[PDB]
Design a protein around this nucleic acid. Structure first.
Ligand SMILES: O=C1c2c(c3n(c(=O)c2O)[C@]2(CC[C@@H]4C[C@@H]42)N(CCN2C(=O)C=CC2=O)C3=O)CCN1Cc1ccc(F)c(Cl)c1
Ligand SMILES: O=C1c2c(c3n(c(=O)c2O)[C@]2(CC[C@@H]4C[C@@H]42)N(CCN2C(=O)C=CC2=O)C3=O)CCN1Cc1ccc(F)c(Cl)c1
Ligand SMILES: [Mg+2]
Ligand SMILES: [Mg+2]
Ligand SMILES: [Mg+2]
Ligand SMILES: [Mg+2]
Ligand SMILES: [Mg+2]
Ligand SMILES: [Mg+2]
Ligand SMILES: [Zn+2]
Ligand SMILES: [Zn+2]
Lengths: 368, 184, 368, 184
DNA sequence: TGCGAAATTCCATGACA
DNA sequence: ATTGTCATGGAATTTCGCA
DNA sequence: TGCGAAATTCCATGACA
DNA sequence: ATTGTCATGGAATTTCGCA
């Protein structure tokens, strides 16, 4: 834009160029005496190359790119031009970290009845004990009642074998699990359809979704650790002891044990609660139905000062799962198809695939 | 006197020898006295070790105050007595040759022996895989005397597998001839 | 204490036992009709065994152990007895997690002059490039100026070889590093004594102490990642490009590049700042001395609501470095010998060894 | 006219062939025109590739606006001209057989040639390891004309290694006889 | 003596594995 | 015998250009 | 109708690799 | 086509025992 700069040198006003400054010609280039010093005003036709050259030195963000440019040049709304470049640098978009936190977590309603929802997951590999390396953890959502099964691998075969023993007691409406090879298999889907069990899956690489079982994994390990202090790690024989120990342990916030929430009566275990001895099983089952409904339910916490929530059509980027050494931590921009809830979203990547992801594994693409 | 409750008394007994299925020959039968809930464990023998191996699984879910059985060798052994003493379980025995349990229990054990027999005919070597379905059937079976099924009495909720189809349990003339053909 | 319980049954008042309750005898045991129900009052001589039996079921904390006990018994100040037991359970003390956060971080003063303090660390293993797997990062504390050296291992030999090339420019007062094999060696101590360089070491397993270099490690990798997008990871030839790129990059908060803080003048690099062209080198060096002193210094952040700060004589526990599977995450209690600063401490473990640790790798032993 | 600054002009030259030390035979000498700061890189030849390999290390710390050298083959080559063009470095040459630099620089290059000679005598094969100490010596050497050392002029601070001991630099009668013994 | 917009400053967020 | 750091891009706040 | 102490509730912290 | 959870032990607050 040498035409735009011509009128400037003459002396007549152009939108963006402050009138109170002296625009002169020197060394065959339009200059301006600014408070900071004399800066070259490059023609609009040159500014993109300049912004790009400055940015490409260390692939710097807004201010660091501006501070370089400002050493030599001046032009109206420089940062608008810096930001246009940042938003078009594929390398910056896929390598840089987010600076916007996810919206506050959801506290899904507790399943209403026992056997409405199970949460399943594997712990392991653990030190080999009796040829076993893994533990299948099954947590009833409503009660917290846990069933532990030692396995030789986190396989479909071992899950099916174990779940066939569990399901002899009662059959669940839904089985929630993560996207582990063992649960996403066709053989497992077949095993569940065959029984009227609905398989629900967590968003990928988001274990907080399986929070219920994950949290119980912590207790199982903490207790095994304690019981194995100063002894070899022979956990296989402890699984039943741990299962019974935990299923009969008070949750200080509920003032109930998973056993009590499942049966409404302690069995012949130490310190069994005697409070309903004079009640009939019906009077007892009535009180249990009342306890199950009145349990404490946590509320969503306050959103952090700089949180972001998904919007349909928003350009968002998925986190690379197992990023190789010296490779980007982010995927290329994607479009938000549907906002399932404020923490779960459906995205369409560049390939054309529909993915249901957690906002924890997303960042909103910067500079729009 | 305090009302009857679950885990007050478990009635245990062995069914078998049955035709071998997955190397197993017996079924240890555990029936909760109050609810009538049934747990079935396949064993390879009616021994104390097989009883202890099986009951160790059950007693990881709930411990009964009393275990009731006949004077079978597996239950009268000092090993079984030591196991129960360790768990604070009182052992109880019926008089030899006079097996007394309870009306509900006697009736339940009858349904078990009959339901097993019904499904054995045709597939006498496939019963290992059927124990979970047999158990769900038995536990979602309406009690005419109590108005509720053993699943309802134990959990205080309806089951996701209601067994509304009240089957024959009595062998068909076709199953009778097929059953008398196996006994050869 | 059957003597203590005798006076109770009679009817005369004992300190701790509320007078308004009816203390009777039944089944050969002292009982009490409490609002919750009738509870057995065990003799003081029995309470320790009871508390221990309840606790040992699932090695539960205060409330969960109390809720079990309270099902059968009642005695004055039950929790005092529960807490005495918790504080004596070695398994609980070494396995349980802390619930008290560290005090707020210190923001050590920026070194006054260049070469006063260097921060050194290794990045790697990286994808092999020209037989090289590691990068030796040397950050001047005052300026941020970085020197990158490709190495075949994080060895003393490679550090010495590299540092001999660096030290041809200037010799530093102090070299701060972590406790890596390469820097804690006798050969390295010898190399530094030989030069008047004082070796300073970070508390073990606390990379925030080497914060200055660690943070620069992030930039080096972010830039290498960007420059290697869609190309094989041949980083060896990029080290000089990256070094120059970063040393000449603006720190938006300082409004200076590490080069400018080291020399007070840009070299012949793109967008070199021309602001001191008319100044003499002396006028320029004078302004540089003024810039170096006026740089922004961050302040310690507010302490979290539930923070803990070390006290001499306090029973504290060190974190197990590489805890084996199913093994405790904590060491046995230790005594705080000296509080070096509110974030660094000297501890004496059970062995009798003096260790200078970070409070981030400590937890205050619960129940005193 | 604008005052002299660091990185305005680097004066480069080769010293050697020297007795081989760690396979190296030459020293490329870089002297900043303004501060008089010296950088010494050992090469295996006075070639363009060895000059480019060495200067690529230096130009990763700071880039001079101008490089000044004599008409040596390594500096007059089109490869060296392409390298400098890429870095925006202007090349400058002294007239053949008439090597002009600057007073400060001519004097510095003299101290370099003499300091190297002084330490070569006795250990002519150990000079590779000495280049860092030689460089620190040279850069913490007080300038009578400027009042400051090259370390002070470049960094604007005192050095942690002040070379207060102003050594002879002139060979002792013992070093003279030992030097004339090597030349055999 | 005050407006609208641009420039600058602030600062939470996240990563140095 | 030691100790976090700072690029980043929206938001908040200050400054600029004009009157 | 209010005191001091015990009991209960709250809730940040950290780990499920 | 889904979604965090909850034991833990100091601190805060409520309740108890007595008057
Ligand atoms: O529980 C898990 C966990 C984890 C993983 N996986 C699980 O099944 C699983 O249950 C799988 C295994 C296969 C399947 C796809 C899933 N992978 C992929 C393969 N892989 C690696 O990439 C590294 C280890 C590993 O197995 C996980 O990384 C890691 C987090 N943790 C602990 C945790 C951390 C933070 C929290 F907030 C919570 Cl609540 C829980
Ligand atoms: O920088 C490091 C880092 C780390 C380690 N080490 C370093 O030298 C080092 O520099 C050594 C290596 C040997 C020496 C004893 C130290 N080990 C022990 C052996 N080892 C493992 O136990 C696991 C990997 C590994 O090398 C570290 O774990 C991990 C954290 N990071 C990144 C980081 C994380 C969080 C932060 F906040 C900051 Cl600022 C930085
Ligand atoms: Mg999993
Ligand atoms: Mg998991
Ligand atoms: Mg019998
Ligand atoms: Mg390190
Ligand atoms: Mg590091
Ligand atoms: Mg010459
Ligand atoms: Zn970029
Ligand atoms: Zn314990």
């Amino acid at each position: 834009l040498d035409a735009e700069l011509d009128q400037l040198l003459q002396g007549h006003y152009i939108k963006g160029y402050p009138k109170q400054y002296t625009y002169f010609l020197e060394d065959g280039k339009v200059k301006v005496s600014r408070p900071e010093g004399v800066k070259i005003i490059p023609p609009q036709s040159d500014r993109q190359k300049i912004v790009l050259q400055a940015h490409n030195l260390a692939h710097t963000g807004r201010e660091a790119t501006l501070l370089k440019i400002a050493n030599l040049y001046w032009w109206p709304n420089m940062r608008k031009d810096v930001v246009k470049q940042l938003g078009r640098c594929q390398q910056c978009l896929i390598t840089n970290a987010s600076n916007k936190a996810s919206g506050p977590i959801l506290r899904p309603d507790r399943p209403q009845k026992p056997f409405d929802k199970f949460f399943i997951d594997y712990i392991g590999p653990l030190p080999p004990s009796q040829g076993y390396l893994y533990v299948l953890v099954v947590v009833d959502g409503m009660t917290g009642f846990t069933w532990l099964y030692p396995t030789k691998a986190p396989s479909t075969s071992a899950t099916v074998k174990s779940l066939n023993v569990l399901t002899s007691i009662a059959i669940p409406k839904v089985i929630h699990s993560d996207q582990g090879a063992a649960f996403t298999s066709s053989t497992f889907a077949e095993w569940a359809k065959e029984r009227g069990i609905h398989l629900e899956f967590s968003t990928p690489y988001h274990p907080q979704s399986s929070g219920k079982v994950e949290r119980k994994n912590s207790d199982i390990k903490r207790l095994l650790t304690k019981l194995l202090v100063g002894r070899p790690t022979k956990w296989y024989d402890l699984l039943p002891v741990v299962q019974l120990a935990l299923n009969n342990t008070y949750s200080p916030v509920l003032k109930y044990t998973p056993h009590q929430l499942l049966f409404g009566i302690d069995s012949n275990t130490p310190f069994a609660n005697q409070d309903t001895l004079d009640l009939t099983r019906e009077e007892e089952l009535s009180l249990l139905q009342e306890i199950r409904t009145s349990l404490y339910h946590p509320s969503t916490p306050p959103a952090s000062s700089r949180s972001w929530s998904p919007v349909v059509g928003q350009l968002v980027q998925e986190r690379v799962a197992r990023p190789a050494s010296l490779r980007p931590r982010w995927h290329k921009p994607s479009t938000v198809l549907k906002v399932l809830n404020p923490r779960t979203v459906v995205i369409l990547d560049h390939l054309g695939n529909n993915r249901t992801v957690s906002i924890d594994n997303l960042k909103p693409t910067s500079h729009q | 006197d305090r009302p009857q409750k679950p885990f007050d008394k478990f009635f245990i007994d062995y069914i078998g020898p049955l035709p071998p299925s997955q190397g197993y020959l017996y079924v240890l039968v555990v029936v909760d006295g109050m609810t009538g809930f049934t747990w079935l464990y396949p064993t390879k023998a009616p021994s104390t070790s097989a009883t202890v191996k099986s009951l160790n699984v059950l007693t990881s879910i709930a411990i009964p105050k009393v275990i009731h059985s006949d004077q079978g060798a597996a239950f009268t052994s000092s090993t079984f007595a030591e196991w129960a003493k360790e768990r604070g379980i009182h052992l109880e025995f019926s008089t030899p040759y006079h097996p007394q349990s309870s009306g509900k229990v006697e009736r339940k054990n009858s349904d078990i022996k009959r339901l097993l027999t019904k499904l054995l005919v045709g597939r006498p070597t496939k019963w290992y895989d059927l124990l979970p379905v047999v158990q769900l059937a038995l536990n979602n079976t309406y009690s005419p005397v109590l108005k509720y099924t053993p699943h309802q009495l134990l959990f205080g909720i309806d089951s996701n597998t209601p067994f509304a189809n009240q089957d024959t349990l009595d062998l068909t003339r076709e199953e009778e001839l097929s059953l008398l053909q196996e006994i050869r």
